[PDB]
């Protein structure tokens, strides 16, 4: 109630079914286009010219095999704008060159900025502390490291993940065979934060549900709660005793408990992001030098570490000619690593 | 020397478990 | 009740292409090589 | 690219006569090869004896030659080793061993032709992938 | 409790169904025809089953030139 | 609408069947209607299988699980498992489908129309979960029924045409069992066999005389026990050990079905006697052994001396010793040397595989069966592409053994979960704390601190 | 009371610092045995012939491993599913060569962890709690059974059980991908949704509760001091948290019922992980991931590769290289 800025602010912040906000102006168009570009590409668009693959329902792929694939390696890290020097405003050619990939990755990046600005905006209006926005920095670090930094350190966008279920499976397997990414302690910390987070999610939900106060007559206990009630719905005291006696230690502070539930998965995703930044440069935890020196000199020395590099060597030689078509690899049968019989 | 290091860190963690359980700050209502 | 709200727009930006796409994909099930 | 009359034109006999198969016969041949043969010969190899494949160049050097409809139809009636020296009906599906290979029991002469036609057409489509094994998957 | 008409009121009302028993099938049929006419192939540049390879060609039309990729695809399509 | 909302019953819609715990009439309806569902599927599924069935292809190439069950009873089949008459399959399908209409009728009647509780109406049919004597009585009736079911199998085997016997001398065939095993040392000896490799507990049963004999024992045991339970009430030590409530009894039965589900999984996976490989396909162990046999036959035909052929590792490429010295197939199938099957046994002597027999006596029918089993190994994708995971599309095959083992593991696992769920709920409800902790009577607040 | 009665009273006492209980009577010695054997083997066991081909793999620290490469190595493929306790061996030296410690460890551990789950039921009953925490734990437990027992059973050998080591775990995963295409299996996909979603909802819940903590402290104190163990009053404003989250998405996508919220938190990762476990336990019997290899074919019959075919090429690399001296015949059929 003043100038147009403040009238616009009023309208942006109306209490409605779908809150809009100033953040909504960035979020909505970007999220909409990222999602719609994904549905459009997976439904109708090929990857024949960029990868030599079919990738759409139109060509016969299913929900598991469709993708919006990255552009050809020859595109380098082109922004591949519709009006740019590659497509020169031709929508058809832009689709065939992988323009939907950078369209989705970049609108998706701006959309996540908008979602996180939305978390801050709504927190400020409702008067809560903005820890949800803070927690969301972990999704952001993962998206930015894997979809932007990783391919920026490599030769081109071609080596970013393609947006598809099987395409992402391929990306995992490539990181095993080429980066030995399972050996990387930043990935191991990610795995600890994800599995530890799922652990905390399960154990905290089960503990609350099993230390509930009898607050109703129902044998179905969900109705026996009121959002505005003053009282805890479950017994922290009994929960603490149970875990102290089962496991040896237990939470006693509910505030610490909930902060730790933020801390663990958020921290694990941030650690995995750092490992991927190293992989952008092929700065891998690929090897243990002492293992290689021993194994090179001692043909009877074998560990699970040397067994896994043999698997990686198989993955690289068998997958590279079709996975990296711009390399024009021809590997005669006689050079392919294979064990006996297989 | 590496085996010693790994087993030493591991032993410290098992000791830490013993103190964290039996010499925790007791929970007080 | 108003008819054409922000919500109404939200719903149709998603619902409209969804039905068009579903018809496109149904037609695809009869394509032979 | 298309499945044309030309792709479908294969050697009928050892003397250079050809036969052009219909698309219906091509479909039938794939279907019947799946029905009676693919458990051992998927993709043109041979699971229980990988030394012998169904490549046309391999079939040509078989005795009697098997790189034509007649040699393949005859193989399905009275299969031999690669040198023509032993009859192996007792261990390889054939019309003469339809008692012990029951899936051969209701294959007609027409069906054998369609299967033979599949064996010759498929490498014209797939090239070295036919009879190549996992290297070419 | 933000003002808008409840969804359950809308989708159980006769008038919603009068509008939508025509718009929903119309959209679906339009999607159907976008494919059945072949138009989808041409808008997006997706090969038909007979257009991935020429009859005797057997290498993929992979784009190899950043700035003349559009021309390569056009020549590949020739 | 007696007890058909949360307010009156205490149970939300998604736990709606718990509303039935003390309404014996409607609960009988639920139970009978459900038995109709089972019988329905058995009949409809059999007709579906029969309608799809091409008698000259192996059953196991056709996605069949029910026809194989009927064939094993000796209906419809002759030597080698050759199908001679599909009519018995048809009869089985139709009789179940018709029977399910009867059960469905009774189910709907009791659930929807009949007395909601049976206690007022009848004291024989009414029951109280807490009536220990009525519980063991009903249990006794069902035991007698099950005992008669077991003896029906004995009756088939002995008096009504026999059972399919994969081990029949001269080759698999239907055979009448005249000398069923009655010796309790053999019958109960199976139960004390180790479940580990080379032993296999009851899954090791390898002849129809033991199978028939075991069901003679089981039929008698069930009938005797059923009589026992009709005429007794639980002893005091039983009374003090168990929870006595509907939910408790559901839980015990959930545990037992979970256990049985795991046992069935291993039975179909390993056993080729009551799951003849003629009908169900080769076992995993069998197909792996058949591959080694295949290449031994091939290579020896090419002139290899398979006894003395040293493989890359130093172990015999074709033949090696088990850890106790028996001659066994080499390569990875070393793990499968406990496998036994009618096509391989003629080659085994007192010291294991006999080299003399291998060199001289392998018949073409053994070569064929080993090639068939190697190429029907129970490996395949969820969309039924047969073969290893890297296989190209062509062969539409997933073994009936894989379908049956996987399904039953899933079911057995969730039944263990339901056991824990219900056993733990039944304990809490019996003690009065299943709805939560009394805020004014919280047990832990009356306990001394741990430290 | 008599000796037995006092003993029973002690075993089941709600007052012991660590609950014992009847499950605990079995759990304690079995977990102790598995732990001691594991620790000693991980430090000092000599190389183990996992694949029965007289090619021993070194797992222990003193024989050239570090924490990442070290493992207790599975028992020998020559053993298969045979029970191989110490007394089955001619000597401890034979027992060690053949991977005896692996069997001892995994059997005692599975027994002990199963009793850990019973003990969770047991104590909840002693404390007057609802009983289903043990059902949440059945999910990780089922997953440990899948990889140490069900998978070996299906494949016919404990040499195919998951190794007790960090790099051995990755070996097991990579071989499993070659042999079952697990990534393409919907039960593993549901497990991923379970763990990614568990992590997501963990962070969500942590952040929503933390965001709505009631002001009880000054800026120089940790807000955690604003909560006291055993206080009656809830420590955050759920109405505030729901007001935030219903607006972030839309009102009806948010829980205002704490009981429903916490039930969802339990159920989502627990159900997903049950499917993960059933993925492994059914690929144990070789019902494998979807196979779309060469599913897309052009008008002539040329194969048009999809991302599924590129997965296939990576799987083939794993397959041909794994256990490079162990296969003599062309198919890997377990
Ligand atoms: C009350 C609870 C009881 C608890 C007590 C615990 C102590 C008991 C130990 C039980 C566990 C045993 C593990 C080993 C099981 C196994 O290798 O079982 C395999 C055996 C079958 O063994 C095989 O049996 C075979 C029988 O076939 C032989 O005979 C056949 C005859 O036709 C054929 O000829 C065949 O070719 C020939 O080899 C051979 O002997 C094999 O070598 C042998 O390996 O199954 C069997 O004994 C029966 C199957 C047992 C069920 C196993 C299920 C596992 C359950 C865990 C579920 C998850 C828990 C979730 C928690 C959350
Ligand atoms: C907030 C909404 C938003 C945001 C942040 C983006 C962001 C982006 N879009 Mg998307 N887009 C949107 C909404 C949005 N879009 C909508 C609603 C549509 C439907 C029309 C599209 C359709 C679309 C397409 C089809 C494409 C993009 C592309 C892009 C990228 C390049 C944009 C660019 O270079 O602009 C440059 C312009 C600006 C930065 C505006 C600057 C305004 C300044 C401050 C004032 C200067 C104005 C001046 C007076 C005018 C003088 C000009 C004169 C010399 C002629 C970038 C990721 C491209 C891409 O993704 O390629 C892979 C692409 O091809 N967008
Ligand atoms: C095997 C599956 C099964 C069976 C046998 C039952 C059985 C029953 N349930 Mg449960 N239920 C089930 C699954 C089942 N339920 C599932 C999956 C859910 C969650 C969706 C529920 C949720 C639920 C609730 C919430 C309640 C029940 C109740 C009941 C009972 C009373 C039904 C009633 O009042 O009908 C009224 C319905 C009708 C009159 C509609 C017709 C119903 C009939 C049976 C349809 C039969 C169709 C069939 C094709 C006819 C063939 C006839 C032919 C042979 C001649 C009945 C015994 C109620 C209860 O416990 O009462 C005390 C109750 O409140 N159920
Ligand atoms: C013991 C149960 C069982 C088993 C082992 C089989 C096995 C088989 N069936 Mg039969 N069938 C069953 C029950 C079973 N069926 C039931 C209940 C029906 C009625 C729907 C059928 C109706 C039927 C038809 C109409 C056909 C088959 C066919 C087949 C074959 C191929 C199956 C396939 O491709 O699966 C595809 C796999 C799936 C669709 C995935 C199912 C996975 C489920 C959804 C997950 C289960 C999880 C758990 C139970 C849920 C709990 C939730 C948790 C939170 C508690 C195979 C031999 C085919 C055939 O070859 O016939 C000759 C065929 O045409 N079946
Ligand atoms: C286990 C299943 C079961 C049980 C415990 C009951 C129990 C009851 N029924 Mg229900 N019912 C059932 C199944 C069952 N019924 C089925 C399958 C149908 C459809 C045919 C019905 C249709 C039905 C109606 C329409 C009525 C009852 C009634 C009754 C009551 C009296 C019965 C009586 O007086 O005995 C009389 C018994 C005989 C004269 C001898 C019975 C001879 C049987 C059929 C032969 C037994 C052979 C063998 C053991 C069967 C094996 C079946 C198996 C393979 C599936 C009682 C509560 C009545 C009631 O509710 O009153 C208000 C009533 O009106 N029933
Ligand atoms: C579904 C079948 C069934 C069910 C549910 C029951 C249920 C009952 N029975 Mg009955 N019983 C049955 C069939 C059944 N019975 C049959 C067929 C017979 C004839 C043999 C009997 C003969 C019988 C007698 C003689 C007695 C009972 C008793 C009881 C009660 C307590 C049982 C108990 O504590 O077991 C739990 C088992 C134990 C406590 C034994 C010790 C635990 C061992 C070590 C477990 C080892 C098993 C392990 C998992 C390995 C399995 C493999 C194994 C084969 C090697 C209860 C009402 C008792 C009673 O109260 O009579 C009125 C009693 O004295 N039954
Ligand atoms: C013979 C087996 C059996 C029987 C008779 C019961 C009966 C009962 N259960 Mg148990 N249960 C079982 C096995 C069984 N359950 C198994 C195997 C599990 C493991 C998942 C459970 C887990 C379970 C839970 C978690 C709960 C019950 C509850 C109940 C009660 C309400 C059931 C209901 O209304 O569902 C209504 C049905 C639905 C809402 C449909 C469920 C859809 C399933 C999950 C998907 C199937 C997909 C398909 C197969 C593919 C009732 C006494 C409730 C309770 O404890 O009451 C005392 C309850 O909260 N059951
Ligand atoms: C790109 C682009 C653009 C945009 C576009 C858009 C925006 C679009 C949208 C689109 C859309 C928006 C679409 C949609 C679609 C959808 C669909 C296709 C759906 C489907 C679904 C289904 C199939 C379901 C399933 C399921 C589930 C999920 C679960 C439950 C069960 C079931 C199975 C049912 C523009 C123009 C700017 C330009 C440039 C480029
Ligand atoms: C209670 C209840 C329920 C349930 C129900 C039930 C479960 C029922 C059952 C039912 C049933 C279980 C039914 C059945 C029926 C059957 C029938 C109706 C049959 C018929 C048949 C026929 C007619 C045949 C024919 C034929 C022949 C003879 C030959 C060949 C061909 C043919 C197949 C055509 C529910 C869930 C809903 C819920 C509510 C309550
Ligand atoms: C048919 C047959 C046969 C035979 C069989 C038989 C003769 C069987 C028997 C069986 C039996 C004879 C079984 C038994 C079982 C038992 C059980 C399963 C038990 C359980 C128990 C319980 C569960 C308990 C519980 C408890 C405790 C422990 C403590 C206290 C508390 C209570 C009470 C809770 C044979 C193999 C020859 C061949 C094939 C066919
Ligand atoms: C979208 C970013 C806009 C930045 C705000 C620009 C200030 S614009 C500002 O608005 C006033 C309202 O009180 C007018 O009265 C005044 O004339 C004008 O200077
Ligand atoms: C449940 C009622 C089923 C009717 C039982 C049919 C008997 S079965 C019948 O019995 C003959 C001996 O009499 C056998 O020779 C014959 O092979 C067998 O099919
Ligand atoms: O061991 Mn461990 O891994 Ca199950 O596959 Mn066969 O075996 Mn061996 O090869 Mn692939
Ligand atoms: Ca055509
Ligand atoms: Cl390996
Ligand atoms: Cl091998
Ligand atoms: Fe919480």
Task: Please name each of the domains of chain F with its CATH number.
Answer: 1-281+378-451 (no CATH), 282-377 (1.10.10.670)
For residue G270, which of G179, G164, G135, G175 has the smallest C-alpha distance? Answer: G135
Distance of residue F6 Cα from the nearest chain A Cα, in angstroms: 8
Residue with tokens 């092929």: A282
Query: Is F288 an 8 Å CB contact of chain G?
Result: yes
* Ligand 4 nearest-atom number relative to CA G278: 47
Whole-angstrom distance, CA of residue A196 vs CA of residue G208: 19
DSSP sequence for F225-281: HHHHHHH----HHHHHHS--SHHHHHHHHHHHHHHHHHHHHHHHHH-STTTTHHHH-
Beta bridge partners of G225: none
Q: Is D1 on the interface with G (CB under 8 A)?
A: yes
H or E stretch including A163? Answer: strand A163-164
Rounded CA gap, G66 and G59, in Å? 9
Q: Are A21 and A121 in contact (CB under 8 A)?
A: yes
Distance CA F46, CA F131 (A): 41
- How far apart CA G273 and CA G264 sit, in angstroms, is 14
Residue holding tokens 């799809």? F52
Sign of the C-alpha dihedral computed for residues G288, G289, G294 and G295 taken in this order:
positive
For D:117-136, CB contacts with E below 8 A are 127
Cα-Cα end-to-end distance for chain D? 20
Please, what's the b/e burial string for D100-130 (b: 16 or more CB within 10 A of its CB; e: otherwise)?
Answer: ebbbbeebeeebbbbbbbbbbbbbbbbeebb
- Segments of G181-315 assigned E as strands: 287-288
What is the secondary structure of G162-176 as a DSSP string?
Answer: PPEEHHHHHHHHHHH
For residue A266, give the chain G residue with the closest CA: G203
E1-78 — its CATH code?
1.20.5.860
Query: CA-to-CA distance for F143 and F223, rounded, in angstroms?
Result: 6
Residue D106 forms contact with F (CB below 8 Å): yes
- Dihedral sign of CA atoms A62, A65, A71, A73 in order: negative
User: Which residue's alpha carbon is at the smallest distance from atom 9 of ligand 13?
Assistant: G332
Nearest to A314 by CA among A187, A185, A173, A184: A173
The H or E element containing residue D10 is: strand D9-11
How far apart CA A37 and CA A107 sit, in angstroms, is 9
Task: Burial-class residue C29 by CB neighbours within 10 Å (0-12, 13-18, 19+).
Answer: exposed
Token representation of residue F448: 């001394």
Query: What b/e readout covers F363-396, taking b as 16+ CB neighbours within 10 angstroms?
Result: eeebbbbbbbbbbbbbbbbbbebbbbbbbbbbbb
Q: N- to C-terminal Cα distance for chain E?
A: 61
- Is residue G102 within 8 Å of G72, Cβ to Cβ? yes
CA-CA distance, A76 to F210, in Å (whole number)?
72
Orientation of helix A185-210 relative to helix G133-145, angle to 10°: 140
Q: Which residues of B touch F445 (CB under 8 A)?
A: 29
What is the DSSP pairing of strand F163-165 with strand F173-175? antiparallel
Determine the structural domain holding residue D94 and report its residue range: 1-137
Task: State the Rg of chain D over Cα.
Answer: 14
Measure the CA–CA gap between D32 and D112, rounded to whole angstroms: 8
DSSP secondary structure string for all residues of F418-430: HHHHHHHHHHHHH
Contact E53 G302 (CB under 8 A): yes
E strand or H helix at D18, and its extent?
strand D18-20
Closest-CA residue in chain A for G297? A60
Least Cα distance to F218 among F201, F204, F202, F234 occurs for: F202
State the closest ligand 13 atom to the C-alpha of G51, by its place in the atom list counted from 1: 1
F216: its two tokens: 């003679």
Tokens of G247: 């607006």
Q: What are phi and psi of D52, to 5 degrees?
A: -115, 120
Is residue A95 lining ligand 2, measured as CB closer than 6 Å? no
Nearest residue to F80 (alpha-carbon basis) of F104, F103, F58: F58
- Round to whole Å and give the CA distance between B2 and F297: 53
Q: Are G119 and G44 in contact (CB under 8 A)?
A: no
Tokens of G182: 């697990």
Q: In residues, how long is chain D?
A: 137
User: What region, left, alpha or beta, does residue D2 occupy, with left being phi > 0 and alpha being psi -120 to 50 degrees?
Assistant: beta
Give the Cα separation of C8 and E16 in Å (integer). 13
The answer for residues whose C-beta is within 8 angstroms of residue A145's C-beta and 6 or more apart is A272, A273, A274, A276, A277, A280
Which chain G residue's Cα is nearest to C32? G299
Axis crossing angle, helix A185-210 with helix G258-283, rounded to the nearest 10: 130
Structure tokens at A46: 């090929």
- Evaluate: CB of F231 within 6 angstroms of ligand 4: no
CB contact under 8 A, A44 and C24: yes
Task: Give the span between the Cα atoms of F440 and D63, in whole angstroms.
Answer: 95
Q: Enumerate long-range contacts of D61-64, CB under 8 Å, 24 or more apart.
A: D64/D14
Cβ proximity of D116 and D69 under 8 Å: yes
Domain count, chain G: 1
**Residues F232 and F171: beta-carbon distance below 8 Å:** no
**Measured in angstroms, how far is the CA atom of residue F196 from the centroid of ligand 1?**
6
Strands F380-381 and G287-288: parallel
Q: Which of G17, G61, G63, G65 to mutate to test the interface with B (most CBs of B within 10 A)?
A: G61
Go through chain C and tell me how many residues it has. Answer: 33
The three-state secondary structure class of G159 is helix
Domain range summary for chain E, segments of one domain joined by +: 1-78
Beta carbons of G192 and G289 less than 8 angstroms apart: no
**CB–CB of G70/G111 below 8 Å?**
no
Distance, CA of F260 to CA of E78 (rounded, Å) = 66
- Alpha-carbon distance of F2 to E2, in angstroms, equals 38
Cβ-based burial of A13 (10 A; exposed 0-12, middle 13-18, buried ≥19): middle
Give me the phi and psi of F349, to 5 degrees please.
-115, -170
**What are the residues facing F321 on neighbouring strands?**
F327
Span between the terminal Cα atoms of chain G, in Å: 58
Angle at F397 between CA F393 and CA F401, to 5 degrees: 145
Q: Is A131 exposed, middle or buried (0-12, 13-18, 19+ CB in 10 A)?
A: buried
- Report CB contact under 8 Å: A44, C7: no
F271 ligand 1 Cβ < 6 A:
yes
* Pair of tokens at residue D82: 């690669």
Give the span between the Cα atoms of C20 and C22, in whole angstroms. Answer: 6
Surface-to-core class of residue G173, CB atoms within 10 Å of its CB (0-12 exposed, 13-18 middle, 19+ buried): middle
Which of F15, F83, F14 has the alpha carbon at shortest distance from F49?
A: F83
Could you please report the per-residue DSSP string of F56-106? TS-GGGTT-SHHHHHHHTTSSB-GGG-B--SHHHHHHHHHHHHHHHHHHHH
G99's tokens? 């991977």
Q: How far apart are CA D91 and CA D101, in angstroms?
A: 9
Q: Are F136 and F233 in contact (CB under 8 A)?
A: yes
In three-state secondary structure terms, A184 is coil
End-to-end CA distance of chain A: 77
- Distance between CA atoms of F143 and F228, rounded to whole angstroms? 10
User: In this structure, are strands F348-349 and F352-353 parallel, antiparallel, or unpaired?
Assistant: antiparallel
Cα(F89) to centroid(ligand 5), Å? 29
Give start and end residues of each alpha helix (H) in G49-165: 92-97, 100-126, 133-145, 151-155
Please say whether the beta carbons of F357 and F349 come within 8 A: yes
Q: Calculate the alpha carbon distances from D24 to D3, D29, D110, F396 in Å.
A: 12, 9, 12, 21
Is residue D23 classed exposed, middle or buried when 0-12, 13-18 and 19+ CB atoms within 10 A define those classes?
A: exposed
Closest CA to G59 of G49, G46, G76, G50: G46
Question: Which pairs with CB-CB distance under 8 Å and at least 24 residues apart come from G39-45?
Answer: G40/G101, G41/G72, G41/G101, G41/G105, G42/G70, G42/G71, G42/G72, G42/G164, G42/G165, G43/B3, G43/B7, G45/G72, G45/G73, G45/G96, G45/G101
Check: CB of residue F50 under 8 Å from CB of residue F32: no
Q: Rounded to whole angstroms, how far apart are CA atoms G156 and G332?
A: 13
Distance CA A36, CA A107 (A): 11
CA distance G113 to G23: 10
Give dist(CA D20, CA D10) in Å, integer. Answer: 6
Taken in order F111, F116, F121, F127, the sign of the CA dihedral is positive
Closest CA to F74 of F146, F160, F171, F168: F160
How is F140-195 classified by DSSP, letter by letter? HHHHHHHHHHHHHHHHHHHHSS-EEETT-TTS-EEE---S----HHHHTTGGGS-S
User: Which residues are within 8 A (CB) of A135 and not within 5 positions of it... i.e. 6 or more apart?
Assistant: A262, A266, G203, G204, G206, G207
Q: Which residues contact G106 (CB under 8 A, 6 or more apart)?
A: G34, G148, G149, G158, G161, G164
Chains C and F touch (3+ CB pairs under 8 A): no
**Residues with Cβ < 8 Å from G110, sequence gap 6 or more?**
G144, G145, G148, G149
Peptide bond into F155 cis (omega under 30): no
d(CA A196, CA A203): 10
Confirm if A269 and A138 have CB atoms less than 8 A apart: yes
Helix (H, G, I), strand (E, B) or coil at F451: coil
**Which residues are close to ligand 16, an ion, with C-beta < 5 A?**
F 331-332; G 327-329
C-alpha–C-alpha distance, residues G61 and A326, integer Å: 44
D66, D72 Cβ separation under 8 angstroms:
yes
Of F183, F219, F195, nearest in space to F267 by CA: F195
Is D114 within 8 Å of F69 (Cβ atoms)? no
Q: Whose CA is nearest to atom 10 of ligand 13?
A: G332
Chain breaks in chain E (C to N over 2.5 A) after: none
Residue of F275, F273, F71, F46 lying closest to F156 (CA atoms): F71
**Cβ atoms within 10 A of the Cβ of G141, count?**
18
Count: domains in chain D:
1
Residue A201 Cα to ligand 17 middle (Å):
9
CA F68 to chain centre: 13
Least Cα distance to G309 among G292, G322, G321, G297 occurs for G292
Beta bridge partners of D18: D11
Are G281 and F409 within 8 A, CB to CB? yes
Going by alpha carbons, the residue nearest to atom 7 of ligand 12 is: F160
| Contact present, D76 and D115 (Cβ < 8 Å) | yes
Answer positive or negative: Cα dihedral of A175, A176, A179, A182. Answer: positive
The Cα angle at residue A86 between residues A83 and A89, in degrees rounded to 5 = 30
Counting ligand 9 atoms within 8 A of each CB, the residue from F14, F17, F30, F33 with the most, and so the one to mutate, is F33
The dihedrals phi and psi of F37, each to the nearest 5 degrees, come to -55, -45
- Rounded-to-integer distance, Cα F401 and Cα F287, Å: 12
Over chain G, what HEC string results?
A: CCHHHHHHHHHCCCCCCCCCHHHHHHHHHHHHHHHHHHHHHHHHCCCECCCCCCCCECCCHHHCCCCCCCEECCCCCCCCCCCCCHHHCCCHHHHHHCCHHHHHHHHHHHHHHHHHHHHHHHHHHHCCCCCCHHHHHHHHHHHHHHHHHHHHHHHCCHHHCCCEEHHHHHHHHHHHHHHHCHHHCHHHHHHHHHHHHHHHHHHHHHHHHHHCECCCCCCCCCHHHHCCCCCCECCECHHHHHHHHHHHCCHHHCCCCHHHHHHHHHHHHHHHHHHHHHHHHHHCCCEECCCCCCCCECCCCCECCCHHHHHHHHHHHHHHHCCCCCCCCCCCCC
Two structure tokens written together for F78: 């002759």
Distance in angstroms (rounded) separating the CA atoms of residues G133 and G121: 7
Query: What is the dihedral angle through the alpha carbons of F44, F48, F51, F57, rounded to the nearest 10 degrees?
Result: -130
Distance CA G225, CA G228 (A): 7
Q: For residue F290, give how far its alpha carbon lies from the nearest alpha carbon of chain G (Å).
A: 10
**Is E20 part of any known ligand binding site?**
yes
């Amino acid at each position: 109630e003043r100038g147009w800025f403040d009238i616009l602010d009023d309208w942006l912040k109306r209490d409605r079914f779908v809150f809009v906000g100033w953040s909504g102006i960035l979020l909505f168009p970007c999220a909409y286009l990222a999602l719609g570009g994904w549905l459009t590409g997976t439904t109708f668009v090929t990857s024949w010219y960029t990868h030599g693959l079919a990738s759409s329902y139109l060509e016969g792929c299913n929900f598991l095999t469709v993708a919006v694939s990255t552009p050809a390696n020859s595109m380098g890290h082109s922004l591949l704008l519709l009006w740019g020097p590659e497509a020169q405003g031709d929508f058809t050619r832009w689709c065939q060159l992988g323009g939907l990939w950078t369209f989705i990755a970049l609108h998706g990046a701006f959309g996540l900025i908008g979602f996180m600005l939305r978390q801050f905006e709504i927190a400020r209006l409702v008067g809560v502390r903005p820890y949800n926005a803070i927690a969301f920095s972990a999704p952001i670090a993962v998206f930015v490291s894997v979809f932007l930094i990783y391919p920026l350190g490599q030769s081109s966008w071609f080596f970013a993940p393609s947006f598809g279920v099987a395409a992402i499976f391929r990306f995992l397997l490539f990181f095993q065979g080429f980066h030995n990414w399972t050996l990387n302690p930043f990935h191991m910390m990610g795995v600890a934060g994800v599995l530890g987070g799922a652990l905390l999610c399960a154990i905290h939900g089960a503990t609350v549900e099993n230390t509930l106060f009898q607050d109703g007559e129902g044998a179905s206990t969900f109705r026996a709660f009121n959002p505005t009630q003053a009282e805890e719905t479950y017994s922290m005291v009994t929960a603490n005793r149970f875990w102290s006696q089962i496991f040896g230690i237990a939470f006693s502070n509910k505030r610490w408990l909930h902060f730790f539930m933020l801390f663990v998965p958020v921290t694990g995703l941030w650690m995995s992001a750092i490992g991927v930044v190293g992989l952008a440069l092929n700065l891998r935890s690929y090897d243990f030098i002492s293992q290689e020196i021993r194994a090179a000199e001692d043909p009877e020395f074998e560990t699970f570490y040397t067994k896994n590099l043999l698997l990686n060597e198989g993955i690289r030689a068998w997958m590279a000619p079709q996975d990296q078509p711009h390399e024009n690899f021809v590997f005669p049968e006689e050079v392919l690593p294979r064990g006996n019989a297989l | 020397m590496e085996t010693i290091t790994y087993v030493f860190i591991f032993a410290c963690i098992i000791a830490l478990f013993f103190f964290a359980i039996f010499f925790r700050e007791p929970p007080r209502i | 009740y108003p008819i054409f709200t922000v919500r109404w727009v939200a719903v149709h930006t998603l619902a409209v292409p969804t039905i068009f796409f579903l018809g496109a994909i149904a037609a695809m099930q009869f394509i032979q090589r | 690219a298309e499945l044309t009359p030309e792709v479908l034109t294969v050697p009928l006999n050892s003397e250079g006569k050809t036969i052009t198969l219909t698309e219906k016969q091509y479909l039938e041949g794939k279907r019947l090869f799946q029905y009676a043969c693919a458990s051992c010969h998927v993709g043109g190899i041979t699971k229980t004896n990988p030394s012998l494949d169904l490549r046309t160049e391999t079939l040509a050097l078989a005795t009697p030659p098997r790189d034509n409809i007649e040699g393949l139809v005859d193989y399905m009636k009275n299969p031999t080793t690669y040198d023509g020296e032993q009859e192996i009906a007792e261990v390889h599906p054939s019309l003469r061993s339809a008692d012990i290979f029951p899936k051969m029991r209701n294959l007609t002469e027409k069906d054998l032709v369609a299967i033979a036609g599949h064996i010759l057409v498929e490498p014209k489509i797939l090239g070295d992938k036919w009879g190549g094994g996992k290297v070419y998957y | 409790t933000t003002g808008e008409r409840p969804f359950s009121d809308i989708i159980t009302s006769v008038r919603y169904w009068v509008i939508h028993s025509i718009t929903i099938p119309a959209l679906f049929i339009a999607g159907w025809l976008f494919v059945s006419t072949g138009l989808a192939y041409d808008v997006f540049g997706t090969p038909r089953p007979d257009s991935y390879y020429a009859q005797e060609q057997r290498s993929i039309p992979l784009v190899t030139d950043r700035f003349e990729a559009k021309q390569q695809v056009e020549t590949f399509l020739e | 609408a007696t007890n058909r909302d949360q307010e009156s019953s205490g149970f939300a819609w998604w736990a709606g069947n718990a509303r039935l715990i003390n309404l014996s009439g409607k609960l009988l309806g639920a139970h009978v209607a459900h038995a109709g569902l089972i019988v329905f599927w058995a009949g409809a599924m059999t007709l579906f299988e029969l309608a799809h069935f091409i008698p000259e292809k192996p059953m196991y190439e056709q996605g069949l699980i029910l026809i194989p069950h009927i064939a094993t009873l000796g209906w419809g089949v002759g030597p080698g498992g050759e199908v001679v008459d599909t009519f018995p399959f048809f009869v089985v399908g139709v009789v179940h489908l018709i029977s399910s209409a009867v059960l469905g009728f009774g189910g709907v009647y009791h659930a929807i129309r009949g007395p909601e509780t049976l206690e007022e109406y009848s004291s024989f049919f009414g029951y109280d979960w807490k009536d220990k004597n009525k519980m063991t009585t009903i249990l006794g009736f069902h035991l007698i029924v099950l005992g008669i079911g077991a003896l029906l199998l004995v009756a088939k085997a002995m008096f009504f045409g026999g059972l399919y016997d994969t081990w029949a001398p001269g080759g698999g065939d239907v055979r009448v069992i005249t000398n069923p095993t009655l010796d309790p040392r053999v019958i109960f000896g199976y139960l004390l066999k180790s479940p580990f490799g080379g032993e296999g507990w009851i899954v090791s049963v390898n002849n129809l005389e033991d199978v028939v004999g075991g069901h003679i024992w089981i039929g008698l045991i069930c009938i005797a026990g059923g009589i026992w339970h009709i005429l007794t009430t639980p002893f005091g030590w039983a009374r003090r050990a168990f929870i006595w409530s509907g939910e408790a009894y559901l839980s015990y039965s959930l545990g037992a079905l979970s256990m049985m589900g795991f046992i069935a999984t291993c039975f179909v996976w390993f056993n080729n006697t009551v799951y003849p490989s003629e009908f169900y396909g080769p076992t995993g162990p069998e197909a792996s052994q058949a591959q080694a046999m295949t290449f031994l036959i091939r290579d020896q035909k090419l002139g290899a001396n398979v006894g003395s052929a040293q493989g890359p590792t130093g172990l015999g490429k074709y033949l090696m010793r088990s850890p106790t010295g028996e001659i066994i197939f080499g390569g990875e199938t070393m793990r499968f040397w406990d496998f036994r099957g009618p096509w391989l046994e003629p080659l085994r002597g007192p010291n294991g595989l006999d080299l003399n027999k291998i060199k001289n006596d392998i018949q073409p029918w053994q070569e064929r069966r080993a090639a068939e089993y190697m190429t029907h190994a129970p490996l395949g994708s969820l969309n039924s592409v047969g073969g290893v995971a890297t296989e190209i599309n062509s062969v539409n095959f997933v073994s009936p053994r894989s379908w049956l083992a996987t399904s039953h593991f899933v079911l057995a696992f969730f039944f263990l979960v339901g056991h824990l769920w219900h056993a733990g709920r039944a304990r809490a409800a019996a003690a009065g704390f299943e709805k939560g902790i009394d805020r004014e009577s919280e047990p832990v607040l009356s306990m001394p601190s741990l430290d | 009371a008599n000796l037995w009665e006092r003993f029973c009273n002690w075993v089941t006492s709600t007052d012991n610092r660590l609950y014992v209980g009847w499950f605990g009577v079995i759990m304690i010695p079995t977990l102790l045995a598995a732990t001691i054997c594991f620790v000693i083997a991980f430090i000092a066991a000599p190389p183990v012939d996992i694949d029965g081909i007289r090619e021993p793999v070194s797992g222990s620290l003193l024989y050239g491993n570090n924490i990442i490469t070290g493992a207790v190595v599975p028992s020998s493929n020559a053993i298969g599913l045979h029970f191989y306790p110490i007394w089955e061996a001619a000597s401890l030296d034979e027992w060690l060569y053949n991977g005896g410690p692996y069997q001892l460890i995994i059997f005692h551990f599975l027994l002990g962890a199963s009793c850990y789950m019973g003990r969770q039921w047991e104590l909840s009953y002693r404390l007057g709690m609802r009983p289903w925490i043990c059902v949440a734990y059945s999910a990780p437990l089922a997953s440990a059974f899948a990889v140490f027992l069900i998978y070996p059973i299906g494949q016919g050998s404990f040499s195919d059980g998951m190794p007790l080591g960090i790099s051995g775990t990755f070996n097991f995963m990579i071989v499993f991908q070659a042999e079952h295409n697990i990534l393409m299996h919907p039960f593993h996909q549901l497990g991923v949704a379970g763990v990614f979603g568990g992590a997501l909802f963990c962070a969500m819940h942590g952040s929503l509760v933390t965001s709505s903590l009631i002001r009880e402290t000054t800026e120089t104190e940790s807000a955690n001091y604003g909560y006291k163990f055993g206080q009656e009053e809830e420590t955050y404003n759920i109405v505030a948290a729901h007001g935030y989250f219903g607006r972030l998405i839309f009102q009806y996508a948010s829980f205002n019922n704490s009981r429903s919220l916490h039930f969802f938190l339990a159920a989502w990762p627990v159900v997903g992980v049950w499917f993960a476990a059933l993925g492994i336990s059914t690929m144990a019997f070789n019902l494998n991931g979807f196979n779309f290899n060469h599913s897309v074919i052009d008008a002539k019959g040329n194969v048009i590769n999809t991302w599924a075919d590129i997965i296939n090429r990576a799987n083939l690399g794993m397959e041909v290289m794994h256990e490079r001296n162990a296969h003599n015949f062309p198919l890997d059929l377990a």
